[PDB]
Design a protein around this ligand. Structure first.
Ligand SMILES: OC[C@H]1O[C@@](CO)(O[C@H]2O[C@H](CO)[C@@H](O)[C@H](O)[C@H]2O)[C@@H](O)[C@@H]1O
Ligand SMILES: OC[C@H]1O[C@@](CO)(O[C@H]2O[C@H](CO)[C@@H](O)[C@H](O)[C@H]2O)[C@@H](O)[C@@H]1O
Ligand SMILES: OC[C@H]1O[C@@](CO)(O[C@H]2O[C@H](CO)[C@@H](O)[C@H](O)[C@H]2O)[C@@H](O)[C@@H]1O
Ligand SMILES: *S(O)(O)Oc1ccc(OCc2ccc(NC(C)=O)cc2)cc1
Length: 468
């Protein structure tokens, strides 16, 4: 028997629900799907729906009942979704679909994407104080998976991530950022799976690698949790003890791998942490050298930004942690992947579903110690026909990096699908995510975005649920 939800988590939850119950109710975001074999007919159906929605009978029908009725139609090759809070927004969106015009809350394509989605599991720099809290309180599938990870992390490290999520007075550090984002990644992905979705492949970046291993069927949930827990506390404890000459900084610079090779001849202790994008690289090393490369970049009109850490992951500074990381991971059981993996640990190379296991102890050591070939993984995915990249995160930081690589590789219309974001309603964000999966033809049962009807008022008087 794993540990249950702590008394403190329950106390915090109760206070959070009381705060929620006293807030003004916001209109939900409802997905309205239309489709046909031909785009011309799709546009006609959008126009007919808009005209009906303008009528007195249409105006008296809830958006939810309209959306539910639309979800039970046949879903053709040419698809569109209008995301709306009220009838005016719905009608404007539908008019744009009918006219072939773009609009912020409208997705419309002539046919399905050819290859399945790549799930992107990153995390660094995505965290914020209240991440995951709103969705935890309002979505029971998400909540159940958060609690499952919370129990496992309690067992491994002896504290509750759910307490961190629910207590607005608490914020995240090097350790707790990692385990909490991992929990959110697991819960987001399983929420998606609950609605019929699945990755065709995964790609990880540094803390995200552990979640990527789980979704690729390479480790059980328990063993993926061991992978993130081990690196998280070692990193956090190691970094807190660094002072003076032991400090190693990390910084994003606008230099490519090829530029780095030349630039580094002047800085003998700098190392590459992350190849993030074609012209963006995260570097690490002694403060004086990091400051000098930043100064060189600014003098050449290139972007450069220092991260808030006294330690550099993915450098030789990790060497003293590796023996303990080894000991703590003894007994994990790497399994044969059930989807593709672009391994940014193994220089961005692809591993097919059903291939040999990769996620052994040496994998986690190499992962922590050596560079992250992120841009290389994305490029390999683009070169093998992938166009949809879906990021599981509290904020879509990595998607910006993906967009740079996709554009550089000649793909100018990638489907870049975020999940959560700070300052965005978390329930609405997930509606949008799943609507996009539907529009592009990826696995997703749009019927499950609506609760089961309990009466005729839960349908609208349109096909296929006209009242006789
Ligand atoms: O939740 C808002 C409201 O609750 C109080 C208690 O009435 O504090 C609870 O919520 C805080 C935010 O998560 C916690 O830090 C605190 O521990 C908890 O008691 C109020 O102080 C707050 O305004
Ligand atoms: O080790 C000398 C060698 O490294 C340089 C490179 O800029 O400096 C670094 O090494 C020093 C230790 O000897 C540190 O004090 C310093 O922080 C670090 O950048 C030069 O001193 C020389 O070429
Ligand atoms: O075209 C089938 C294809 O569409 C998806 C969504 O992209 O599912 C839709 O079509 C199903 C009927 O074929 C419905 O059951 C479902 O509700 C709807 O989303 C994919 O999941 C499916 O492979
Ligand atoms: S691992 O354990 O997560 O260590 C690590 C530190 C830093 C990394 O940088 C990738 C990155 C992240 C964010 C941004 N942009 C922001 C914060 O705005 C650029 C590059 C990766 C791994």
């Amino acid at each position: 028997e794993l540990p249950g939800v702590t008394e403190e988590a329950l106390r915090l939850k109760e206070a959070a629900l009381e705060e929620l119950a006293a807030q003004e109710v916001t209109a939900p975001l409802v997905p309205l799907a239309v489709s046909a074999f031909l785009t011309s007919r799709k546009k006609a159906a959008a126009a007919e729906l808009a005209d009906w929605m303008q009528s007195p009978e249409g105006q008296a029908s809830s958006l939810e009942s309209i959306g539910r009725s639309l979800s039970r139609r046949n879903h053709g090759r040419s698809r569109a979704v209008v995301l709306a809070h009220d009838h005016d927004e719905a009608i404007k969106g539908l008019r744009a679909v009918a006219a072939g015009k773009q609009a912020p809350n409208v997705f419309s394509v002539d046919g399905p994407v050819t290859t399945g989605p790549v799930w992107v599991l990153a995390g660094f720099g995505a965290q914020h104080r209240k991440m995951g809290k709103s969705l935890y309180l309002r979505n029971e599938v998400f909540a159940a998976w958060i609690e499952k990870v919370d129990a496992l992390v309690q067992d491994e490290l002896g504290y509750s991530v759910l307490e961190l999520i629910l207590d607005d007075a608490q914020d995240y550090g090097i350790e707790t950022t990692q385990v909490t984002i991992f929990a959110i990644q697991i819960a987001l992905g399983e929420l998606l799976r609950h609605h019929g979705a699945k990755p065709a492949a995964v790609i990880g970046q540094s803390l995200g690698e552990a979640a990527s291993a789980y979704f690729a069927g390479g480790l059980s949930l328990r063993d993926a949790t061991r992978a993130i827990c081990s690196r998280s506390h070692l990193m956090g404890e190691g970094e807190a003890m660094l002072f003076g000459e032991y400090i190693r900084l990390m910084a994003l610079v606008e230099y490519s791998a090829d530029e780095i090779r030349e630039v580094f001849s002047d800085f003998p202790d700098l190392e590459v942490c992350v190849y993030a994008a074609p012209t963006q690289t995260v570097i690490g090393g002694p403060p004086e050298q990091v400051d000098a490369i930043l100064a060189r970049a600014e003098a050449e009109g290139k972007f450069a930004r220092k991260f808030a850490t006294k330690g550099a992951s993915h450098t030789s500074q990790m060497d003293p942690l590796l023996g303990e990381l080894t000991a703590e991971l003894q007994g994990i059981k790497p399994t044969s992947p059930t989807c593709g993996i672009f391994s940014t640990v193994h220089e961005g190379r692809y591993i097919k579903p059903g291939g040999e296991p990769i996620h052994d102890v040496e994998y986690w050591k190499k992962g922590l110690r050596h560079s992250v070939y992120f841009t290389h993984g994305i490029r390999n995915a683009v070169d093998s026909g992938h166009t949809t990249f879906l990021e599981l995160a509290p904020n879509p930081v990595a998607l910006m990096q993906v967009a740079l690589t996709t554009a550089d590789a000649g793909l100018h219309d990638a489907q870049l699908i975020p999940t959560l974001a700070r300052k965005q309603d978390e329930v609405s964000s997930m509606v949008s995510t799943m609507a996009q999966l539907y529009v592009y033809g990826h696995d997703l049962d749009i019927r499950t975005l609506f609760s089961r009807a309990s009466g005729p008022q839960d349908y609208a008087n349109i096909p296929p649920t006209r009242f006789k």
